[PDB]
């Protein structure tokens, strides 16, 4: 599939002939090296980046996450009070949203690419937004989202979580972290787990913070082009 995608330019087929793979076999036998190498490979080189990720992840630590598990089955005593979460699981429709928010986050570890783990953790976030929205009959507020997410990680135990989150950070293309969700939902997961070991509001507010200025940035990045053209586009009418 990656071969058929690369074929149909031929410079992408030169990337098919290029394969960093032998260099990976060399440097990764002694962990932080392969992260910088993959990031360098991505920096040197358009959806073919996701296809190269799709290949390299399918082919190419991952242990000791227990500390979370013991701490989660610990935190079993925690009720949606003091998480102040807007989720009322009595109504069937939200209980069904919660269940498959969890089902998603479980499904993550099973996944192929880091990006496909990212796809999972969006849908988890989306179902969380649904659980909240159906509860209060009103769209979730950003301050609501983060706690509710932990609650989904706090009950139900995704196989090998910290393994997953370190693996995604290691390689996936940080063209990720700019505008778009899967990485905003990601950084929310990080904030979630990091919080779990004993403020929340700060973590929510800070995520809102960064996400906005990145929205505004990708706007101004455009309006520059819009203005540039609009004036050039028009200086030459007459």
């Amino acid at each position: 599939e990656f071969i058929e995608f690369l074929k149909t330019h031929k410079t992408g087929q030169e990337i098919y002939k290029q394969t960093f793979l032998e260099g990976m076999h060399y440097k990764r036998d002694l962990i932080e090296e392969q992260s910088e190498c993959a990031q360098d490979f991505y920096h040197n080189v358009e959806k073919i980046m996701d296809q190269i990720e799709k290949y390299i992840m399918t082919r190419l630590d991952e242990k000791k996450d227990l500390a979370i598990q013991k701490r989660i089955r610990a935190l079993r005593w925690v009720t949606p009070q003091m998480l102040c979460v807007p989720v009322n699981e009595d109504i069937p429709e939200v209980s069904d949203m919660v269940v498959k928010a969890i089902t998603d986050i479980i499904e993550m570890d099973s996944k192929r690419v880091p990006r496909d783990k990212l796809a999972c953790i969006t849908k988890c976030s989306k179902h969380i937004f649904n659980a909240i929205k159906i509860t209060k009959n009103e769209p979730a507020s950003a301050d609501d989202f983060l706690p509710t997410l932990i609650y989904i990680v706090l009950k139900g135990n995704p196989p090998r979580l910290q393994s997953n989150i370190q693996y995604i950070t290691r390689f996936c293309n940080p063209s990720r972290l700019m505008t778009g969700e899967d990485g905003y939902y990601f950084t929310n997961l990080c904030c979630a787990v990091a919080f779990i070991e004993k403020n929340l509001d700060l973590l929510s507010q800070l995520n809102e913070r960064q996400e906005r200025i990145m929205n505004e940035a990708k706007k101004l990045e455009k309006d520059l082009i819009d203005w540039t053209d609009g004036i050039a586009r028009e200086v030459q009418d007459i």
Partner: protein, 83 residues
């Protein structure tokens, strides 16, 4: 007259080089905090490397805005060609 124009230039240029040095001191304390970001512990690499992507996206927009200004002006130059 010349006198207070000789001494004020002295004091003004001494104020400028002091001010500009202070700014650099500030920019170094800032960079130090940017270097306090990534470490072994209490990380959330996620948040840190978000804040990175942000400020990296803005420091291109300065080349963007500058070049937006110089490219609009080069268009003005051809409107000057109109005659």
């Amino acid at each position: 007259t010349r006198d207070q124009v000789k001494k004020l230039q002295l004091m003004l240029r001494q104020a400028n080089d002091q001010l500009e040095k202070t700014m650099k001191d500030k920019q170094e304390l800032e960079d130090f905090i940017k270097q306090s970001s990534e470490d072994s512990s209490h990380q959330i690499s996620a948040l840190v490397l978000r804040a990175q992507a942000s400020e990296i996206l803005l420091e291109e927009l300065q080349q963007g805005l500058s070049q937006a200004k110089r490219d609009v002006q080069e268009q003005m130059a051809v409107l000057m060609q109109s005659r």
